[PDB]
């Protein structure tokens, strides 16, 4: 799920 | 909301899958989407992401340089291409959807089973 | 990297009665951005996996309020006040903190009729 933000 | 995972089947080791992704009953376009396994009696693994902006991509450790995910807006389609199977990567095949609202996956599809086998 | 624990592995439970799971993190969820990205879903008997809670504590669509999530930091609790027949499956946790994104190894939940 984190590599959809950053 | 409707994710429908097809492709999924028997290969040998070694060999080439290529898993779909329909999915309907929102605007595809703008969500980001994953693809988890679950080997039968066991966990939740996640095996590839894909953003809806500029075809970026993620993948898994174990699945670097064998897996390809990607994704067709026109045809509401998500992809799996799946090379160099290998009897680990025997599972179903969850077609996931990325809520940017609430931070989190929501939607899972029914899956689709991947057995490798000789 | 980040490895997710959860607690019991295994909860049987009388109906009308509380139940409990723990997932733990081996590193703090709280994300840079000042969210922690902790969720919850259940697996029930031959069915795909629903949300039930993200963001720690809010309740997704059609929830009922007996489910409710605590926590913070490295330490998470999903909690149902009174159990009932149609709770019972395989609870994972998961976080979306910390790439890559890790689940927890599941809790079935098993009902004392």
């Known amino acids: 799920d984190a590599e959809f933000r950053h | 909301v409707q994710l429908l995972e097809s492709g999924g089947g028997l290969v040998q080791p070694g060999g080439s899958l290529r898993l779909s992704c329909a999915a309907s009953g929102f605007t595809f376009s703008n969500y980001g989407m994953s693809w988890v396994r679950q080997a039968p009696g066991k966990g939740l693994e996640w095996v590839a992401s894909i953003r809806s902006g500029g075809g970026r991509t993620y993948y898994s450790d174990n699945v670097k340089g064998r897996f390809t995910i990607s994704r067709d807006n026109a045809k509401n389609s998500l992809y799996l291409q799946m090379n160099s199977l290998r009897a680990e990567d025997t599972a179903l095949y969850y077609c996931?959807?990325?809520?940017?609202?609430?931070?989190?996956?929501?939607?899972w599809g029914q899956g689709t089973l991947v057995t490798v086998s000789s | 990297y980040v490895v997710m624990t959860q607690s019991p592995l295994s909860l049987p439970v009388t109906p009308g009665e509380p139940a409990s799971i723990s997932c733990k993190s081996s590193q703090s969820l709280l994300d840079s951005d000042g969210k922690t990205y902790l969720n919850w879903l259940l697996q029930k008997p031959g069915q795909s996996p629903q949300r039930l809670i993200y963001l720690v504590s809010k309740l997704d669509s059609g929830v009922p309020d007996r489910f409710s999530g605590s926590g913070s930091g490295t330490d998470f609790t999903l909690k149902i006040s009174r159990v009932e027949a149609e709770d019972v499956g395989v609870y994972y946790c998961?976080?979306?903190?910390?790439?890559?994104?890790?689940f927890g190894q599941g809790t079935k939940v098993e009902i004392k009729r």
């Open positions: 996931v959807r990325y809520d940017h609202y609430s931070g989190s996956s929501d939607y």
């Open positions: 998961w976080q979306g903190t910390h790439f890559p994104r890790t």
